[PDB]
Amino acid sequence: AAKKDYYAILGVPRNATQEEIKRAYKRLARQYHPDVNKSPEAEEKFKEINEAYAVMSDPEKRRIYDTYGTTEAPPPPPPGGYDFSGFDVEDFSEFFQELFGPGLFGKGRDLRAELPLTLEEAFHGGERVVEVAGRRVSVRMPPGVREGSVIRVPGMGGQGNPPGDLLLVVRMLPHPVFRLEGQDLYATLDVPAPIAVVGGKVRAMTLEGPVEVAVPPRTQAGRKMRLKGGGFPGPAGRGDLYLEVRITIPERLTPEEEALWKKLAEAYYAR
Amino acid sequence: AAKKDYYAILGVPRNATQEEIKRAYKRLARQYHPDVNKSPEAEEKFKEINEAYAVMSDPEKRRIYDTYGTTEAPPPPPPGGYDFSGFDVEDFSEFFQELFGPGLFGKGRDLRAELPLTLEEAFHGGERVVEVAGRRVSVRMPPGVREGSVIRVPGMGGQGNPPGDLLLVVRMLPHPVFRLEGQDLYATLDVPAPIAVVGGKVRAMTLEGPVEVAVPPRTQAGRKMRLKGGGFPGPAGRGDLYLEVRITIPERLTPEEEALWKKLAEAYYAR
């Protein structure tokens, strides 16, 4: 209740410098430290010294204390609260609690947020700047990150003593062409009917870019083709790419091309 | 309330034999039977005879009727109760309800079972014979009956006064070709590539039978074609059939056919 004299406790004058306070703390802390001084009186003196230094080491906190009493009631807290890092704040005197209490909060809560990513964003990974309701955060993201993968950004959660963690959970945006299942990718490969019969090379697509795919002679619709290592990356191994063959036909032709298609069609009505 | 004379209703002497009661029932049952006698008076008379015979036919039940009213040893109804299977017990008089009431069981438990049906079986509906627990049961069935549909067969449940009900739930067996969704049907239509380009007729399938489906010129794979009313029937409406076009190519060809396919293929590598 009664205003503690932190200056008397550290044995420094009312107008001491910060370094004067620092060295006074060092001198007195080594004097009353639990494992150097095994006295019952030393426990309380050490506690006092730590409380004194906790307030006086910060110029901002030192000023609050200096201008307390003339203005009777405790002052409004700063945004966020008071930061007494490396100080057992719960063990300090009642005077302290009355004075700094309004801005002494408990363990900060974690914030859990979704990280909506496109197949190619998650595939590459790398550095992503994330703005999720509250703060701007940059994080490293492993190549081939999946749905429900947790990215912990420590200290970026809720405000408190200490602050909480940001927990980002990856969500996968549906893709126009590819379909993810585990580490494997699945896509439809359009193969022109003549190329399917004879067997040639079609231009297909991967997330890395476009590749050439050789289709064997007489490959039917629904034939699944594996491109080893063309799927999602992973720590222990890489997934594959599966292309499902989809026979395609020309929606437009030249009068010359009609003659060829007509002969085949007639041979089908024959069979 | 008053003691009914069952001997007077059946037309038998006070000390008749069990065979004499049986033949007197047959004589009077065929005289006042529902479908042979269309009289309003025959309704009560036939109910009277049914009440009499039910009591009189069983020697244990008949003795109970004979020894009722007198100031002798008062017998509580037997541990097993009274068996009146095949008689509208509640419909009977109160005199019957007072003497046999304590030995009667309540309405029987419902028997619950699954009715596994194929798409074609569910499509057509009608009369079905089913085995549940031990017995066979006939059951009418609406065309286009669906998954989870309840078919209450009254009086075909557990033993009781009256018996309970059979409750069947329709389960749909998976089909090799058709897929049900609501009342709509879905299936894959194989279409030879040359027919898809030029446009012609393909032999498609329904649950009724096979049909001809006219395919327009230049119809791409994935084109979905509605066959009105070709789906599942129902009250107030009929489902559609949807056939998804799947372009097919020949797995075997003639040396003459190779040349036609080879030309188009080389015109595609050129494109």
Numbering used by the authors:
A (entry chain A), B (entry chain B): 2 to 272
What does the paper say about this structure?
DnaJ protects the cell from adverse conditions through the prevention of protein aggregation or by assisting the refolding of unfolded proteins and is an essential partner of the chaperone DnaK in bacterial DnaK–DnaJ–GrpE chaperone systems. DnaJ, the bacterial homologue of Hsp40, stimulates ATP hydrolysis by DnaK (Hsp70) and thus mediates capture of substrate protein, but is also known to possess chaperone activity of its own. T. thermophilus DnaJ is a typical type II DnaJ, i.e. it lacks the zinc-finger domains found in type I DnaJs such as that of E. coli. Crystal structures of the complete molecular cochaperone DnaJ from Thermus thermophilus comprising the J, GF and C-terminal domains and of the J and GF domains alone showed an ordered GF domain interacting with the J domain.
The electron-density map of this structure inspired a third construct, this time of a complete DnaJ from which a disordered stretch of seven amino acids (108–114 in the linker between the GF domain and C-terminal domain; DnaJΔ108–114) was deleted with a view to increasing conformational stability. Therefore, a full-length construct was prepared that lacked the 108–114 stretch (DnaJΔ108–114), which was shown to be functional in refolding assays. The subsequent substitution of four residues with methionine (construct DnaJΔ108–114/4M) allowed SeMet-SAD phasing, resulting in the determination of the first crystal structure of a complete functional DnaJ containing J, GF and C-terminal domains to 2.9 Å resolution. In all four monomers in the asymmetric unit of the DnaJΔ108–114 crystals the orientation of the C-terminal and J/GF domains differs, showing that the Δ108–114 deletion does not restrict their mutual motion. Moreover, the J/GF regions of chains B and D showed poor electron density, also indicating flexibility. Since the J/GF domains visible in the DnaJΔ108–114 crystal structure each assume a different orientation relative to their respective C-terminal domains, it seems likely that this flexibility is, at least to a large extent, concentrated at the junction between the J/GF domain and the C-terminal domain.
